[PDB]
């Protein structure tokens, strides 16, 4: 089956799948975070309330107990996935929080970026910023490597930047986007980082202790951005074999991580697509878009 989900009154910007594949989380412009049953009759249970701005990005921690939510109200909330109670508010950035990531494995860490041009490292136990990286241009997307040593940030400067937690220096610069980067994501192996950008280029970059030194490992095409200037996010399949990235042309694009052939171009959406997610066990795709509906495609 396909399965069509509806309920969000406004644009859906992000959706994720619980690490154990039992539930979905979704949120957008409404300001509500909805939880869904992946199986059964695809029912909706708890609604998380308390964000005053729109929800720009959701993530689960690796355990699926904590759900992180960057909002436009400058606050990043930490949510209990079990009860739906709010845990903490990371008040800190002076402007909109565009995105956030939670470090897997290591002691609890959270990274954020915002329109104030800074990137901040948070320890959820301190109620204060740990480190600050002033960039100079607004920051749109940010992710940790698997070792929790490096911060990867994508902004409007067309240059993905890598930060060293110990040195606090600009370690790496990646050139190869011609325009703003709207969405970043690490492979489950730590091996590769996936990027979307206005230039309509999906680029994979490889991050390793020993690097070729010009890490434009692969380039994919199909994915269109337009006058809506929506943030666009991309995801890796659980096994790193497939790449999905949303577009503004109503199609979900899925590519073969090797041959780079388009495996799927999927319709059903009426408007622009903001995020595509893969179920952690089975070939199921959750596609979230601005038309306020979700699809559960099965491959």
């Amino acid at each position: 089956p396909i399965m069509l989900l509806s309920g969000h009154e406004g644009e859906v910007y992000c959706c994720k799948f619980h690490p154990n594949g039992s539930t979905l989380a979704s949120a957008g412009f409404d300001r509500l975070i909805l939880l869904w049953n992946v199986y059964g009759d695809c029912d909706n249970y708890a609604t998380l309330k308390g964000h005053s701005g729109a929800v720009m990005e959701l993530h689960y921690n690796t355990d699926g107990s904590m759900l992180f939510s960057a909002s436009t109200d400058k606050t990043v909330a930490v949510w209990d996935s079990e009860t739906g109670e709010r845990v903490k508010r990371l008040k800190g950035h002076t402007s909109f929080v565009n995105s956030c990531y939670p470090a897997r494995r290591g002691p609890q860490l959270v990274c954020t970026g915002s329109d104030d041009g800074t990137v901040k490292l948070w320890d959820i136990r301190k109620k204060a910023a740990i480190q600050t990286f002033q960039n100079t241009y607004q920051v749109l997307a940010v992710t940790f490597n698997d070792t929790s040593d490096q911060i990867i940030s994508g902004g409007i400067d067309n240059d993905i930047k890598v930060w060293d937690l110990r040195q606090n220096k600009l370690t790496y610069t990646m050139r190869g986007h011609a325009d703003s980067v709207t969405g970043l994501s690490l492979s489950s192996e730590g091996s590769y980082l996936l990027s979307n950008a206005m230039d309509n280029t999906v680029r994979v970059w490889d991050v390793r202790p020993f690097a070729p030194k010009e890490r434009c490992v692969k380039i994919f095409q199909g994915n269109v951005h337009n006058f809506e200037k929506n943030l666009l996010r991309c995801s890796w399949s659980p096994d790193g074999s497939k790449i999905a990235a949303g577009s503004a042309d109503r199609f979900v694009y899925v590519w073969d991580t090797t041959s780079r052939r388009i495996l799927y171009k999927l319709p059903g959406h009426a408007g622009s697509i903001n995020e595509v997610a893969f179920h952690p066990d089975e070939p199921i795709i959750i596609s979230a878009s601005s038309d306020k509906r979700l699809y559960m495609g099965e491959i």
């Binding site: 040195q167 202790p209 020993f210």
Partner: protein
Amino acid sequence: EELKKHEDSAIPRRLECLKEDVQRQQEREKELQHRYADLLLEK
């Protein structure tokens, strides 16, 4: 018929060996970086 049954078992054993052979290779890769990473600490 026989070639199918004896072969099908041999491949898991072929792969599983190379799988564990790969796991050990990853460890040497995983440490050698850290010594390079510690070059920046002395600076």
